[PDB]
Amino acid sequence: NLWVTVYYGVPVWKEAKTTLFCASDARAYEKEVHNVWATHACVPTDPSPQELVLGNVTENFNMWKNDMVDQMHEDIISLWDQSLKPCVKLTPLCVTLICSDATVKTGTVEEMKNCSFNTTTEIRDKEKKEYALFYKPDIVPLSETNNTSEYRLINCNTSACTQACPKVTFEPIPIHYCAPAGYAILKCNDETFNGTGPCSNVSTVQCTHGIRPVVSTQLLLNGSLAEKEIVIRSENLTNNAKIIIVHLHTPVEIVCTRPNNNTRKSVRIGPGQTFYATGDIIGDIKQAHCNISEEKWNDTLQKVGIELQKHFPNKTIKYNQSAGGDMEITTHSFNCGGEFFYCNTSNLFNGTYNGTYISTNSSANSTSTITLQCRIKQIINMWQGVGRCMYAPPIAGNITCRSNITGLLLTRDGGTNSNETETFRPAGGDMRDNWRSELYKYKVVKIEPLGVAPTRCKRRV
Amino acid sequence: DIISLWDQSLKPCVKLTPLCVTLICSDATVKTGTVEEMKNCSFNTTTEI
Amino acid sequence: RDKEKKEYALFYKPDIVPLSETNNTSEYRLINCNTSACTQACPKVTFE
Amino acid sequence: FLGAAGSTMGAASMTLTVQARNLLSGTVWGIKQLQARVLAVERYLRDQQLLGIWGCSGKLICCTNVPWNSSWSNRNLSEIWDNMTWLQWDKEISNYTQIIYGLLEESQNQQEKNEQDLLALD
Amino acid sequence: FLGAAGSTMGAASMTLTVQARNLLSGTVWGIKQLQARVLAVERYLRDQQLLGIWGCSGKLICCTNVPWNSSWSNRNLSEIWDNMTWLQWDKEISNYTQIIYGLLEESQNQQEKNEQDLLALD
Amino acid sequence: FLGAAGSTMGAASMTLTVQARNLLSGTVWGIKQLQARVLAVERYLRDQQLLGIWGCSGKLICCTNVPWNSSWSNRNLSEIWDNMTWLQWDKEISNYTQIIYGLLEESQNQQEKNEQDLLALD
Ligand SMILES: *[C@@H]1O[C@H](CO)[C@@H](O[C@@H]2O[C@H](CO)[C@@H](O[C@@H]3O[C@H](CO[C@H]4O[C@H](CO)[C@@H](O)[C@H](O)[C@@H]4O)[C@@H](O)[C@H](O[C@H]4O[C@H](CO)[C@@H](O)[C@H](O)[C@@H]4O)[C@@H]3O)[C@H](O)[C@H]2NC(C)=O)[C@H](O)[C@H]1NC(C)=O
Ligand SMILES: *[C@@H]1O[C@H](CO)[C@@H](O[C@@H]2O[C@H](CO)[C@@H](O[C@@H]3O[C@H](CO[C@H]4O[C@H](CO)[C@@H](O)[C@H](O)[C@@H]4O)[C@@H](O)[C@H](O[C@H]4O[C@H](CO)[C@@H](O)[C@H](O)[C@@H]4O)[C@@H]3O)[C@H](O)[C@H]2NC(C)=O)[C@H](O)[C@H]1NC(C)=O
Ligand SMILES: *[C@@H]1O[C@H](CO)[C@@H](O[C@@H]2O[C@H](CO)[C@@H](O[C@@H]3O[C@H](CO[C@H]4O[C@H](CO)[C@@H](O)[C@H](O)[C@@H]4O)[C@@H](O)[C@H](O[C@H]4O[C@H](CO)[C@@H](O)[C@H](O)[C@@H]4O)[C@@H]3O)[C@H](O)[C@H]2NC(C)=O)[C@H](O)[C@H]1NC(C)=O
Ligand SMILES: *[C@@H]1O[C@H](CO)[C@@H](O[C@@H]2O[C@H](CO)[C@@H](O[C@@H]3O[C@H](CO[C@H]4O[C@H](CO)[C@@H](O)[C@H](O)[C@@H]4O)[C@@H](O)[C@H](O)[C@@H]3O)[C@H](O)[C@H]2NC(C)=O)[C@H](O)[C@H]1NC(C)=O
Ligand SMILES: *[C@@H]1O[C@H](CO)[C@@H](O[C@@H]2O[C@H](CO)[C@@H](O[C@@H]3O[C@H](CO)[C@@H](O)[C@H](O)[C@H]3NC(C)=O)[C@H](O)[C@H]2NC(C)=O)[C@H](O)[C@H]1NC(C)=O
Ligand SMILES: *[C@@H]1O[C@H](CO)[C@@H](O[C@@H]2O[C@H](CO)[C@@H](O[C@@H]3O[C@H](CO)[C@@H](O)[C@H](O)[C@@H]3O)[C@H](O)[C@H]2NC(C)=O)[C@H](O)[C@H]1NC(C)=O
Ligand SMILES: *[C@@H]1O[C@H](CO)[C@@H](O[C@@H]2O[C@H](CO)[C@@H](O[C@@H]3O[C@H](CO)[C@@H](O)[C@H](O)[C@@H]3O)[C@H](O)[C@H]2NC(C)=O)[C@H](O)[C@H]1NC(C)=O
Ligand SMILES: *[C@@H]1O[C@H](CO)[C@@H](O[C@@H]2O[C@H](CO)[C@@H](O[C@@H]3O[C@H](CO)[C@@H](O)[C@H](O)[C@@H]3O)[C@H](O)[C@H]2NC(C)=O)[C@H](O)[C@H]1NC(C)=O
Ligand SMILES: *[C@@H]1O[C@H](CO)[C@@H](O[C@@H]2O[C@H](CO)[C@@H](O[C@@H]3O[C@H](CO)[C@@H](O)[C@H](O)[C@@H]3O)[C@H](O)[C@H]2NC(C)=O)[C@H](O)[C@H]1NC(C)=O
Ligand SMILES: *[C@@H]1O[C@H](CO)[C@@H](O[C@@H]2O[C@H](CO)[C@@H](O[C@@H]3O[C@H](CO)[C@@H](O)[C@H](O)[C@@H]3O)[C@H](O)[C@H]2NC(C)=O)[C@H](O)[C@H]1NC(C)=O
Ligand SMILES: *[C@@H]1O[C@H](CO)[C@@H](O[C@@H]2O[C@H](CO)[C@@H](O[C@@H]3O[C@H](CO)[C@@H](O)[C@H](O)[C@@H]3O)[C@H](O)[C@H]2NC(C)=O)[C@H](O)[C@H]1NC(C)=O
Ligand SMILES: *[C@@H]1O[C@H](CO)[C@@H](O[C@@H]2O[C@H](CO)[C@@H](O)[C@H](O)[C@H]2NC(C)=O)[C@H](O)[C@H]1NC(C)=O
Ligand SMILES: *[C@@H]1O[C@H](CO)[C@@H](O[C@@H]2O[C@H](CO)[C@@H](O)[C@H](O)[C@H]2NC(C)=O)[C@H](O)[C@H]1NC(C)=O
Ligand SMILES: *[C@@H]1O[C@H](CO)[C@@H](O[C@@H]2O[C@H](CO)[C@@H](O)[C@H](O)[C@H]2NC(C)=O)[C@H](O)[C@H]1NC(C)=O
Ligand SMILES: *[C@@H]1O[C@H](CO)[C@@H](O)[C@H](O)[C@H]1NC(C)=O
Ligand SMILES: *[C@@H]1O[C@H](CO)[C@@H](O)[C@H](O)[C@H]1NC(C)=O
Ligand SMILES: *[C@@H]1O[C@H](CO)[C@@H](O)[C@H](O)[C@H]1NC(C)=O
C-alpha cells in the first residue's frame, strides 16, 4: 500500500545560527590596503546577488533576538582591535605636563592648551623638552594640586592609549554579510514593516546589501532610507527604557566643519616611534560646528510627530534636550575625516507637536539654518571601554563633511505629570542599535534538504 | 594541554617587571610565636605619572 | 631596576655612529637607534 | 534556488535538483572564511552519508520498501501532494524520525545480505 | 599519474582511473598544510557533486541522452578519438559549458521523475 | 557501534552498517576541534574514494570478478566465516594489499570500457 519514500533537495528550512563572512563590492583596493575595516580581505562580489522572490510564503520575524547584530558588533570590535594593534603606544608620554595657555584670549572656545613636557629621545639617557597643543577635554589637573599648572592626560589612571597609525583611514566602506553554502538569508519586503511580526512578502538571498558601518550616537547618518513612510520601531513602546529607532523617508542634509587652519608636528618618542600632535594654529580661530536646514528639520520632526501620535493617541508629544550625563553620553558623537566631533543638540530637539498640523511653512521656502556647536576630542574611550582607547592623530587643514540623516534614536521620559505633553529625549550609546537599523530585514536559515513522504509505490526488488 | 592552557590564562594579566626593585625589609612578626614568615618590605613604586 | 652597572664590549666599526651634536667627542650610539629597535638572534638558532 | 518554496509537493518534483546544485558552491575574515568553508563540506557530507546508509544515494527520488504507519497517516495522496507545501509537511511530520531512519537502514542492509545470498546461491 | 597526457582519446580510456586515485591522497607550515588539506577536499567534492547532479556518478564513463549540437560539432569520430588528444579538446570545446551542464541536469531530473511515475503507475 | 567485534564474520554481515553510521559526525580547544573536524572528513572521504575507484561504492557488500590466489588461501569457507573473527582476519591477511587494490581498479575500468563498447556497438 503506502510505502515511505525520501526526497533529496526539498525546499524547506529551519532557524539556525552560523558564522557569516564579509564580502566587499569589488572596489579598487590597489592602493587603499590600509582601511580600518580590512575590506580588501573580503571576498569580491563580482556577480549580482540571487534576488529571488518566493511567493505564497509567510515567515515570522523578530529582530531584537537577532544574532546577526551581535556577530556584527563582535566583528567591529575585533576589527578595531586588530587594526589598532601594531601601531604606536603612548606609554612614555604619560608624564607631568606644564600647560600655560595657547589661545590668545577666550576667542570662540579656548579649548587649546600649550602643554610642554620632557620627552625621551632615541638615546635612553638624554631627555628633551618638547611642546604640543592639546585639547581641553584631554588634560586633567594633576592630583594634589594647589591650583597649579600641572596637568596629566585623561587616560593615565585608567589605561594606556595606542595612537592610530596615520595611514589608517576610517572611511565606512560598505560590507556585505554572506551565509555559508547550505544556508540562506531570507528578507522581508513589506514597505511598512513593523520590525517584528510576520511578513507576507519574503525573498531569498545569499549576501546582504552593502551596509555602512557608520558609528554615531543620537542621529543616524548615511543609512538606508525607508520606502514610503516613516517607520517607528521599538521593543514595546510602553517600557520607557527601550530605544525608539525612527526611520525617515526623506534624508536631511547636515554639513559639519572645523574651520581653523590646524597644523601637525611629529615628536620622536623612543627608537623608531613618532607622536603626531597639534603644532600651531595658522590664522584666526573660529568655531567648529554643524549646519542643518531649519525648515526641513521642522518638517521632519512634524512628520515624525504625525507618525508617532497614532501610537500614543489623543496626546501631545514634546521634544526636549538629552538627559543628564557626560559629554560623550549627551552630545551627538560624530566622525568625519578622522576628527571626532561631539555636537551639542539642545536647540535641535526643541519644540512640540500636538494633533493640529501647526506649521504650513513647507508651502513657503526659507534659507534659515540651525547651527549647532561641536567640541573636538583626541583621546576616545568608545564602546564603553570594552575596546582599547585610541589617540586620534590630528589632521592638517580644515575639515568638511556632507552627510545625510536617515534615522533617529529617541527615548521616552513619561510620568504622571505627562498626562498631555509627552517627553521624547535623544539617547544613544548602545552601538548595536546602529546596526539593528540596517539588519532589520534579514534573517538566517539552514536548509534541510531531506524529506519523508509516502507515494504508494514500492521499491523494485 | 595543561601547559598551554596555563600559558594562555597567564598571558593577558599584569606583569611584575616594575616590582623588581630594591626592597627595604624589616620584620613585622617580630614575636617568637614559631610562625614568623611575614617580612614587612617597602620600596619605591612607580605611579601612573 | 635601581642599580646600574658600568660594562664594556668591543663593537665593530660599522655598527657605531658618532652621536648627534658632537664636537668630535667620543660619544657613540648604535646605528639602529634612530630607525627601529633591534632584536638579537637566539644563540641556539642555526642559519644553515 | 528555493524557487518552489511555496508551491505544491508535485511542483517540487522538477525543481529538487536546483536545491542540490547550490549546496557546495559559493585574519578575522580569514577565520570566518575558513569556518564557512569547513561548514559547507560538513553539511553536504552529512546528507550524502545518510543517503548512502539508506542505500538510495545517487538518485533524488527513492522507494524504501517500508510501510507507512497509520499513526503517521492523516490525509489522502491528492490532499498531501496537491494542496500542502513541503514546509508545512516538514512542520507536521517531523516527529518519529530516527526510528524511520533506522528502519530504512536495517531494510537496506537486509536487502544487501539477501541479494548477496541470492548471488552466492546461484 | 597523467601518463597518457600526450596519447590519443581512446588511449586515455584505459588510464582514466589512475588520475582519479591520486586526487585525494598525497605554525607557518602548519597553516599552509591545513589550507592544502582543505583545498584537496573541496576540489574533490566539487567534481563528485557535479557528477552526482548529472546522475552518472559512481562510474567513469557516462551516456547522457542529450543530442550533440551541430554548432559544437566540427570533426568525425575517427578524427576526434584517434588524432586529437584531450588538451586540444579542452582548449576548443570549453564554450557552452554551463548550458551543456544545465541540459544534463534537467535531463537527469526528467529521467528520475519519469521512472518514478512509471513505477508508481505499476 | 562495534558490537560485533568478537562475533563471527557472518554474524557481522547484518550489523556492518552501524559502523558506517557513526563514521562521520559522531583557542586551544578551538584548534583541537578544528583539527578533529577536518580529520573526520578526510578519513571518511578516503574510504569512499577507494570504494568508488573499485566501482562497487553505494553498497556495503561487493563482488569484484577477480580470482582469489592460492598464495593467500589457507582455510575453508566454513573455517573462515564460522570460526575466525574479522580482527584476526585483518591481522593475518593484511599483506599483498596494494596488488589486490590495483587489480580491482583495473578490473573496474575494464568493465566500464567493455560496457561502453557494448552499448556503442548496439
Ligand atoms: C607654546 O609653548 C612653546 C614652549 O612652551 C612655545 O615654543 C617656544 O616659543 C618661543 C617664543 O617664540 C621660542 O623662542 C624663540 O625661538 C626662536 C628660534 O628658536 C631657536 O633659538 C632659541 C634661542 O632664542 C633656542 O632656545 C631654540 O632652541 C632654537 O634653537 C628664536 O629665534 C627666538 O629668539 C628671539 O627672541 C629672543 C627673546 O625671546 C631674543 O633674545 C633673540 O635675540 C631673538 O630675537 C626665541 O628665542 C622657542 O624656540 C619655542 N620652542 C621651545 C621648545 O621653547 C610656543 O611658542 C608656545 N605657543 C604656541 C602657540 O605654540
Ligand atoms: C557620510 O557619507 C559622506 C559621503 O561619502 C561622507 O563624506 C565624505 O567624507 C570623507 C572623509 O570621511 C571625504 O573623503 C576625503 O575627501 C577629501 C576631499 O576630496 C575631494 O577633493 C579632492 C581634491 O580636490 C578630490 O580629488 C576628491 O575627488 C574630492 O573631490 C580628500 O582630500 C580626502 O583624501 C584622504 O584620503 C586620500 C586617500 O587615502 C589621501 O591621499 C589624502 O591625503 C587624505 O588622507 C578624503 O578622500 C569625502 O570627500 C566625503 N564625501 C563627500 C561627498 O563629502 C561622510 O563623511 C559620511 N559620514 C560619516 C559620519 O562618515
Ligand atoms: C610595615 O611597614 C610600613 C612602612 O614601612 C608601616 O606603615 C606605616 O606605619 C606607620 C606607623 O603606624 C604609619 O604612621 C602613622 O600614620 C598614621 C596615618 O598616616 C597618615 O599620617 C602620617 C603622619 O603621621 C603620614 O606620614 C601618612 O602618609 C598618612 O598621611 C598617623 O595618624 C600616625 O601619626 C600618629 O603617630 C605619630 C608618631 O608616629 C605622631 O607624631 C602623630 O601625632 C600621631 O599620633 C603615624 O604617623 C604610616 O602611615 C604607615 N605607612 C607608611 C606608608 O609609612 C606598617 O605599620 C608596618 N607594619 C605592618 C604590620 O604593616
Ligand atoms: C576649507 O575651506 C574652504 C573654504 O570654504 C573649502 O572650500 C569650499 O568647499 C566647498 C565644498 O563643499 C565648496 O562648495 C561648493 O561650491 C560649488 C559652487 O562653486 C562656485 O562657487 C564657489 C564659491 O566660493 C567658487 O569658488 C567656485 O569657483 C564656483 O564659482 C557648488 O556647486 C558645490 O555644490 C559646493 O557647494 C565651496 O565653494 C568652497 N569654497 C571656496 C572658497 O573654495 C574647503 O573645502 C575646505 N577644505 C576642506 C578639505 O574641506
Ligand atoms: C543623501 O541624499 C541625497 C539626496 O537627498 C542623495 O543624492 C542622490 O543620490 C542618488 C544615488 O546616488 C542619485 O541618483 C543617481 O543620479 C545619477 C545622476 O543623474 C544617475 O545617473 C543615477 O542613475 C541615479 N541613481 C539611480 C539609482 O537612479 C541622485 O541623483 C542624487 N541626488 C538627488 C537630488 O536625488 C545622496 O546620494 C545621499 N547620500 C549621500 C552620502 O550624500
Ligand atoms: C624637565 O627637565 C628639566 C631639566 O632640564 C627640569 O628642570 C629642572 O627642574 C627642577 C625642579 O624639578 C629645578 O630645580 C629647582 O631649582 C630651583 C633653583 O634654581 C629651586 O628653587 C627649586 O626648588 C627646584 O629645586 C631645576 O632648576 C630645573 N632645571 C635644571 C637645569 O635642572 C624640569 O623640571 C623637567 N620637567 C618639566 C615638566 O619641564
Ligand atoms: C581617573 O581620573 C579621572 C580624573 O580625575 C577621574 O574622573 C573623575 O571622576 C569623578 C567621579 O566620577 C568625577 O567627579 C564627579 O564630577 C561630576 C561633575 O562632572 C559631579 O557632578 C560628581 O558629583 C562627581 O564629583 C570627576 O569630575 C572626574 N574628573 C574629570 C576631569 O572629569 C576618574 O574617575 C579616574 N578613574 C579611576 C578609575 O580612578
Ligand atoms: C548644549 O547647549 C546648551 C545651550 O547652548 C547648553 O545649555 C546651557 O548651558 C549653560 C552653561 O554655560 C547654562 O548656564 C548656566 O546653567 C546653570 C545650571 O542651570 C546655572 O546655575 C547658571 O546660572 C547658568 O544659567 C544654561 O542654563 C544651559 N541652558 C540654556 C537653555 O541655555 C548645554 O550646556 C550644552 N551642552 C550640553 C552637553 O547639553
Ligand atoms: C518649528 O517647530 C516648532 C515645534 O515643532 C514650532 O514651534 C512651536 O509653536 C507653538 C505655537 O506656534 C508654540 O506653542 C506655544 O509657545 C509659547 C511660547 O512660550 C508657549 O508659551 C505656549 O504655551 C505654547 O506652548 C511652541 O512652544 C513652539 N515650540 C518651540 C518654539 O520650540 C514652530 O512653529 C516650527 N517652525 C516652523 C518654521 O515650522
Ligand atoms: C626611595 O626614594 C627616596 C627618595 O624619596 C630615597 O630616599 C633617599 O635615599 C638617599 C640614599 O639613596 C638618601 O641620601 C642619603 O643622605 C644621607 C644624609 O641625609 C647620607 O648620609 C647618605 O650617605 C645618603 O647620601 C636621601 O637622604 C633619601 N631621602 C631623600 C629625601 O632624598 C630612598 O633611598 C629610595 N629607596 C627606598 C628603598 O626607599
Ligand atoms: C639615522 O641616523 C643615521 C646616522 O646619523 C643616518 O645615516 C646617515 O644618512 C645620511 C643620509 O643618507 C648620510 O649622509 C650621506 O653620506 C654620504 C656618504 O656616505 C654622502 O655622500 C651624502 O652626500 C650624504 O651626506 C650619512 O652618511 C649617514 N650616516 C652614516 C654614519 O652613515 C640615517 O639617515 C638616520 N635615519 C633617519 C630616518 O633619521
Ligand atoms: C514582494 O517583494 C519583491 C521584492 O522586493 C517585489 O518585487 C519587486 O517589484 C518591483 C516593482 O515595483 C520591481 O521593480 C523589482 O525589480 C522587484 N524585485 C525583484 C528582485 O525583481 C514584489 O513586487 C513584492 N510584491 C508584493 C505583493 O509586495
Ligand atoms: C526639558 O527637561 C527639563 C528637565 O530638567 C525640564 O526642566 C524642568 O522643568 C520643570 C517644569 O516645571 C521644572 O519644575 C524643573 O525645575 C525643571 N528642571 C530644571 C533642572 O530646570 C524642561 O522644562 C524640559 N523642557 C520642556 C520644554 O518642557
Ligand atoms: C527652544 O526654542 C525657543 C524658540 O524657538 C527658544 O526660546 C527663545 O530663546 C532665546 C534664546 O535662548 C530667547 O532670546 C527668546 O526670548 C526665547 N523665546 C521664547 C518664546 O522663549 C528656547 O531657548 C529653545 N530652547 C533651548 C534649550 O535653547
Ligand atoms: C508594531 O510595533 C510595535 C513597537 O515595535 C509593537 O508594540 C507592536 O506589537 C507591533 N505590531 C505588530 C503587529 O507587529
Ligand atoms: C482622539 O482623537 C480622535 C481624532 O482627533 C477623535 O476622533 C477621538 O474621539 C479622540 N479620543 C477621545 C477619547 O476623545
Ligand atoms: C495645537 O496647537 C496649535 C498651536 O497654535 C493650536 O492652534 C491648535 O488649536 C492645537 N490643537 C489642539 C487640538 O489642541
Side-chain angles (χ1 to χ4, degrees):
Chain A
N1 211 301
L2 289 172
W3 313 102
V4 64
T5 61
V6 289
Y7 283 78
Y8 183 43
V10 290
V12 311
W13 49 68
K14 214 176 69 62
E15 288 92 26
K17 293 170 151 70
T18 176
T19 72
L20 323 173
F21 58 96
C22 174
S24 82
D25 53 325
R27 205 195 148 273
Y29 302 132
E30 53 263 17
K31 45 181 189 311
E32 294 180 351
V33 289
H34 37 67
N35 199 281
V36 72
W37 281 294
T39 179
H40 66 275
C42 300
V43 190
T45 50
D46 192 28
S48 73
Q50 324 184 290
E51 301 204 73
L52 282 73
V53 58
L54 312 178
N56 288 322
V57 175
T58 57
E59 205 193 350
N60 278 109
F61 279 74
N62 187 14
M63 84 196 165
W64 271 270
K65 298 303 174 186
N66 214 316
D67 200 66
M68 271 185 308
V69 61
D70 305 337
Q71 279 201 8
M72 184 177 177
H73 196 289
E74 288 183 25
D75 290 8
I76 292 308
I77 295 283
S78 66
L79 271 183
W80 188 262
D81 294 357
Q82 74 99 33
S83 57
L84 207 47
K85 179 155 61 49
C87 292
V88 192
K89 192 170 295 193
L90 299 184
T91 51
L93 188 153
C94 179
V95 290
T96 295
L97 267 56
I98 293 301
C99 311
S100 302
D101 202 16
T103 311
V104 172
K105 190 176 180 180
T106 176
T108 62
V109 173
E110 41 181 2
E111 41 174 351
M112 281 305 158
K113 207 100 176 172
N114 195 359
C115 293
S116 49
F117 44 86
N118 282 331
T119 197
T120 313
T121 46
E122 302 94 2
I123 309 300
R124 219 172 43 84
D125 310 334
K126 327 287 186 178
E127 291 183 328
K128 188 188 166 187
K129 189 137 195 169
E130 206 71 29
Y131 83 106
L133 307 192
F134 285 110
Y135 277 95
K136 200 162 283 185
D138 312 325
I139 47 170
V140 190
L142 184 62
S143 305
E144 313 180 50
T145 178
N146 320 310
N147 303 9
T148 52
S149 68
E150 275 162 287
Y151 291 85
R152 68 167 180 85
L153 293 197
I154 192 66
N155 64 283
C156 279
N157 57 312
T158 63
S159 61
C161 294
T162 63
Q163 73 169 357
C165 285
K167 292 301 181 68
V168 172
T169 302
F170 297 107
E171 197 162 41
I173 310 297
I175 284 172
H176 302 258
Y177 263 87
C178 306
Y183 290 72
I185 306 181
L186 311 179
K187 67 168 174 182
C188 277
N189 270 293
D190 281 326
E191 327 299 330
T192 313
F193 183 39
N194 179 284
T196 80
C199 277
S200 64
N201 194 7
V202 175
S203 165
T204 180
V205 69
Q206 195 69 47
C207 294
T208 73
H209 70 286
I211 56 187
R212 290 166 174 267
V214 165
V215 174
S216 67
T217 62
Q218 296 197 347
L219 293 99
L220 289 182
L221 306 153
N222 278 334
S224 61
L225 300 148
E227 190 53 56
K228 61 102 176 179
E229 204 56 47
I230 290 171
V231 180
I232 292 169
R233 311 191 176 96
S234 169
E235 200 167 24
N236 212 14
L237 291 174
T238 56
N239 201 351
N240 279 264
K242 296 307 171 167
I243 311 293
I244 297 89
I245 319 288
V246 190
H247 210 263
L248 312 178
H249 164 50
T250 53
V252 176
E253 190 149 354
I254 187 168
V255 181
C256 289
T257 182
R258 176 204 72 185
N260 52 3
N261 193 0
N262 200 358
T263 53
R264 182 162 96 183
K265 63 172 275 188
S266 53
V267 176
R268 168 76 41 85
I269 296 181
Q273 310 165 333
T274 57
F275 155 73
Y276 302 95
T278 285
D280 205 353
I281 292 175
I282 288 175
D284 212 348
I285 289 188
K286 308 298 190 175
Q287 167 81 262
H289 58 271
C290 296
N291 276 351
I292 314 171
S293 284
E294 189 183 34
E295 164 207 2
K296 311 299 182 192
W297 181 252
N298 207 301
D299 201 25
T300 302
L301 274 186
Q302 195 172 9
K303 289 181 176 184
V304 165
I306 282 176
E307 204 80 16
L308 189 55
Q309 216 166 5
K310 73 165 56 60
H311 299 263
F312 286 84
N314 307 111
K315 265 212 180 74
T316 299
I317 61 166
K318 175 172 64 68
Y319 300 101
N320 206 13
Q321 303 176 1
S322 57
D326 304 0
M327 182 179 72
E328 288 191 336
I329 319 170
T330 62
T331 61
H332 156 67
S333 180
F334 182 76
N335 165 49
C336 65
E339 283 305 290
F340 289 87
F341 285 81
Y342 293 99
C343 301
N344 173 268
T345 74
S346 166
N347 50 324
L348 197 54
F349 288 83
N350 179 28
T352 187
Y353 185 62
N354 65 337
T356 318
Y357 202 73
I358 43 170
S359 185
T360 56
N361 209 26
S362 62
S363 178
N365 198 32
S366 171
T367 66
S368 169
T369 55
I370 183 168
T371 294
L372 72 164
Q373 57 193 38
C374 318
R375 320 195 59 182
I376 294 181
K377 274 184 95 209
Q378 302 263 316
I379 293 154
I380 55 176
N381 314 72
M382 65 180 288
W383 301 300
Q384 277 80 24
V386 69
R388 48 215 294 193
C389 67
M390 183 179 72
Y391 166 78
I395 301 184
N398 54 321
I399 300 299
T400 44
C401 49
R402 318 278 301 218
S403 176
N404 296 2
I405 294 146
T406 77
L408 301 174
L409 270 72
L410 302 176
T411 197
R412 201 160 47 86
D413 202 30
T416 54
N417 60 332
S418 63
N419 291 334
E420 283 306 310
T421 55
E422 200 66 37
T423 59
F424 279 108
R425 306 188 172 276
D430 199 14
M431 203 49 42
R432 66 196 72 204
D433 297 346
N434 296 55
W435 309 309
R436 265 185 197 123
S437 74
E438 286 291 322
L439 301 170
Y440 76 105
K441 285 191 289 193
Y442 301 109
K443 198 200 204 183
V444 64
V445 293
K446 156 183 63 167
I447 319 292
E448 198 164 345
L450 279 169
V452 170
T455 64
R456 202 179 287 174
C457 172
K458 215 187 177 185
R459 195 191 292 198
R460 193 238 59 86
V461 64
Chain B
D1 291 8
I2 292 309
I3 292 276
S4 86
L5 260 55
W6 217 259
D7 291 357
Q8 73 177 359
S9 66
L10 269 72
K11 179 159 60 51
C13 292
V14 189
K15 206 180 297 290
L16 297 187
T17 314
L19 183 63
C20 181
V21 292
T22 293
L23 269 61
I24 289 300
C25 299
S26 65
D27 201 7
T29 313
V30 285
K31 275 74 65 177
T32 183
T34 73
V35 177
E36 301 259 357
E37 287 162 27
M38 299 299 298
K39 191 70 68 68
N40 194 358
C41 295
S42 45
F43 45 87
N44 281 333
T45 195
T46 304
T47 45
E48 310 100 7
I49 311 299
Chain C
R1 219 172 43 83
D2 313 337
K3 325 288 187 181
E4 291 184 331
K5 190 190 166 186
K6 189 138 195 171
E7 197 73 27
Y8 82 106
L10 304 187
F11 284 113
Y12 272 98
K13 201 170 74 174
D15 310 326
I16 54 168
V17 171
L19 205 43
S20 304
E21 313 179 52
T22 187
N23 319 299
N24 304 7
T25 56
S26 68
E27 277 161 288
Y28 291 81
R29 67 168 180 86
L30 293 197
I31 174 63
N32 74 284
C33 286
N34 58 311
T35 64
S36 60
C38 184
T39 62
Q40 82 159 356
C42 284
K44 289 301 182 68
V45 160
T46 303
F47 300 106
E48 197 156 37
Chain D
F1 196 61
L2 280 152
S7 306
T8 61
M9 321 275 268
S13 81
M14 311 75 78
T15 57
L16 73 165
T17 178
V18 73
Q19 275 79 242
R21 75 178 277 103
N22 279 316
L23 278 189
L24 196 63
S25 80
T27 189
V28 186
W29 303 131
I31 278 173
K32 266 161 177 263
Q33 181 77 26
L34 178 64
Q35 167 85 341
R37 281 205 281 149
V38 182
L39 275 177
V41 171
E42 287 179 73
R43 288 260 300 119
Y44 173 65
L45 275 192
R46 205 259 316 275
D47 294 327
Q48 274 306 310
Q49 185 201 16
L50 262 69
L51 279 185
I53 289 300
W54 300 340
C56 77
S57 58
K59 65 184 184 178
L60 318 171
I61 310 170
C62 318
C63 299
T64 50
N65 271 347
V66 164
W68 186 270
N69 198 279
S70 57
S71 45
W72 312 326
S73 82
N74 63 331
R75 274 187 166 216
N76 298 134
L77 291 190
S78 172
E79 295 172 350
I80 287 175
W81 296 79
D82 275 343
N83 181 224
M84 193 166 294
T85 80
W86 263 111
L87 185 60
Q88 306 166 5
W89 181 251
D90 187 30
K91 256 62 175 158
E92 79 169 42
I93 200 66
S94 46
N95 218 334
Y96 293 100
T97 314
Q98 271 78 16
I99 62 170
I100 283 179
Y101 285 16
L103 273 157
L104 299 200
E105 164 194 359
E106 64 197 304
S107 161
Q108 175 57 43
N109 203 1
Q110 269 177 28
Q111 275 175 40
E112 280 295 325
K113 64 173 190 169
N114 285 350
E115 210 268 342
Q116 197 256 317
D117 289 355
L118 191 140
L119 280 182
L121 277 157
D122 206 60
Chain E
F1 195 65
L2 274 157
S7 308
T8 56
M9 292 215 178
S13 82
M14 311 75 78
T15 54
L16 73 165
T17 175
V18 66
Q19 318 166 14
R21 71 179 277 102
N22 284 324
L23 270 188
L24 203 64
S25 57
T27 189
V28 185
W29 304 131
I31 278 175
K32 261 164 177 259
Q33 197 171 357
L34 176 64
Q35 165 86 335
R37 281 204 285 146
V38 182
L39 287 174
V41 170
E42 289 177 70
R43 288 265 299 117
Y44 170 66
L45 274 191
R46 206 260 313 275
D47 296 327
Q48 274 305 312
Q49 185 206 14
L50 264 69
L51 276 183
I53 299 299
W54 302 338
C56 77
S57 54
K59 64 183 185 177
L60 315 174
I61 311 170
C62 319
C63 307
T64 45
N65 265 351
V66 163
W68 185 269
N69 198 280
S70 57
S71 47
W72 314 325
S73 84
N74 63 331
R75 275 185 167 214
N76 297 318
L77 294 191
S78 169
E79 294 174 351
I80 285 174
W81 298 85
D82 273 345
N83 181 226
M84 185 180 288
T85 82
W86 268 108
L87 290 158
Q88 300 97 2
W89 196 254
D90 189 29
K91 257 61 175 157
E92 74 184 43
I93 195 66
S94 49
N95 207 0
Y96 316 100
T97 304
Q98 45 266 49
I99 62 170
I100 277 177
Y101 286 12
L103 275 160
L104 298 200
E105 166 191 4
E106 61 86 20
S107 160
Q108 166 62 33
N109 199 13
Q110 275 185 11
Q111 273 175 40
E112 271 298 321
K113 63 172 185 163
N114 286 350
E115 211 267 342
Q116 189 42 245
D117 292 359
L118 191 140
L119 280 183
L121 278 159
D122 192 275
Chain F
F1 194 63
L2 276 157
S7 307
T8 76
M9 305 208 181
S13 86
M14 311 75 78
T15 65
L16 73 165
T17 175
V18 76
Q19 281 90 23
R21 185 171 172 82
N22 283 330
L23 258 182
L24 197 80
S25 82
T27 190
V28 182
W29 304 132
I31 276 173
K32 265 162 180 261
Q33 282 188 38
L34 178 64
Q35 166 85 342
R37 280 203 285 157
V38 181
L39 258 182
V41 168
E42 288 179 71
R43 289 269 298 116
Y44 171 66
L45 273 193
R46 195 247 289 154
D47 293 327
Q48 276 306 311
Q49 182 206 15
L50 264 70
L51 276 184
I53 289 300
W54 300 339
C56 77
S57 55
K59 65 185 185 177
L60 316 173
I61 312 168
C62 297
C63 297
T64 59
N65 269 352
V66 163
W68 187 268
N69 198 280
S70 55
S71 45
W72 316 320
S73 78
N74 64 330
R75 272 187 168 217
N76 297 132
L77 293 190
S78 171
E79 295 172 350
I80 285 175
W81 297 83
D82 279 344
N83 177 228
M84 191 146 297
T85 81
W86 263 112
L87 185 60
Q88 309 169 5
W89 191 253
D90 188 29
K91 257 63 180 156
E92 76 168 40
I93 201 66
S94 43
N95 217 342
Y96 320 102
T97 308
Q98 53 267 46
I99 301 106
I100 289 175
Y101 284 17
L103 275 161
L104 296 204
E105 162 189 5
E106 61 86 20
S107 160
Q108 172 61 35
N109 198 15
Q110 276 186 7
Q111 274 177 39
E112 287 289 334
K113 63 172 188 169
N114 285 350
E115 207 264 342
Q116 198 256 319
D117 288 349
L118 191 140
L119 275 184
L121 277 158
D122 196 83

